[PDB]
């Protein structure tokens, strides 16, 4: 019964995002019948997320459109989470409430 | 002190290194070469060694397009270079070549 915490939150959110996509789509997409690209679809997920962090338009030449609309959906969600977190942290630092060594550098990188 | 002329050995080793490691890791590739830094390796890739770069004579259309654009946006080479599909240094040299041979 470990309890979510600041150390574990980013890891937690991405953990349950990988699970969210995995359960949803592999219970949603299927008929591969053997194993359908779970490792691979998730690698497409991390690839897309990096691409959006680098602001590089990400277009895979072949791909099923439900898979693509999938990735674009969840990626936009994680983008909304990350961005909102960034705004909020800059508000906290602006008011000078939080003194942390990491959140300042991270928050900087984000902006 | 590190700066200097590019060598066929350094350039081929740069080909192989870029092939193996990938485009986004420059510090790793600069580690193998001597007398060259990471910035220099990257800009040396994207400026010249990159196979997507077009090395050949300019057709008539490319000269029309280059001249027109250069009269449209004076002195901006990094904006024009992607539009004609050539390297900024290359289209520069070719432009001074067009004014040089034009008179």
């Amino acid at each position: 019964a470990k309890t979510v915490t600041k150390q574990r939150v980013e890891s937690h959110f991405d953990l349950e995002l990988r699970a969210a996509v995995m359960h949803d789509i592999l219970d949603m997409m299927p008929e591969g019948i053997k194993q359908n690209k779970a490792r691979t679809i998730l690698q497409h997920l991390s690839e897309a997320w990096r691409c959006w962090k680098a602001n590089i338009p990400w277009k895979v030449p072949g791909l099923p459109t439900p898979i693509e609309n999938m990735i674009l959906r969840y990626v936009k969600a994680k983008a909304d989470w990350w961005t909102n977190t960034a705004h909020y942290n800059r508000e906290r630092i602006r008011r000078g409430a939080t003194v942390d060594k990491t959140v300042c550098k991270k928050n900087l990188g984000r902006l | 002190i590190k700066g200097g002329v590019w060598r066929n050995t350094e350039d081929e080793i740069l080909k192989a290194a870029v092939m193996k490691y990938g485009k986004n890791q420059w510090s790793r590739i600069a580690s193998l070469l001597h007398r060259k830094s990471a910035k220099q390796c990257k800009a040396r890739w994207y400026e010249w060694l990159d196979p997507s770069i077009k090395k050949t004579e300019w057709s008539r259309e490319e000269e029309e397009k280059l001249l027109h654009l250069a009269k449209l946006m004076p002195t901006q080479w990094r904006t024009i270079a992607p539009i004609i599909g050539r390297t900024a240094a290359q289209c520069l040299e070719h432009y001074e070549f067009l004014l040089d041979k034009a008179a």
Binding site: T40, P61, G62, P64 | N24, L72
Partner: peptide, 27 residues
């Protein structure tokens, strides 16, 4: 065949307006 998935081999792990002409020639 449709559900062939391109391997996600990882890489980690342009047009112009004609108004520029009117402006530049104007100046």
């Amino acid at each position: 065949q449709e559900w062939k998935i391109p391997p996600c081999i990882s890489n980690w792990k342009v047009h112009i307006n004609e108004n520029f002409a009117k402006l530049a020639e104007a100046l």
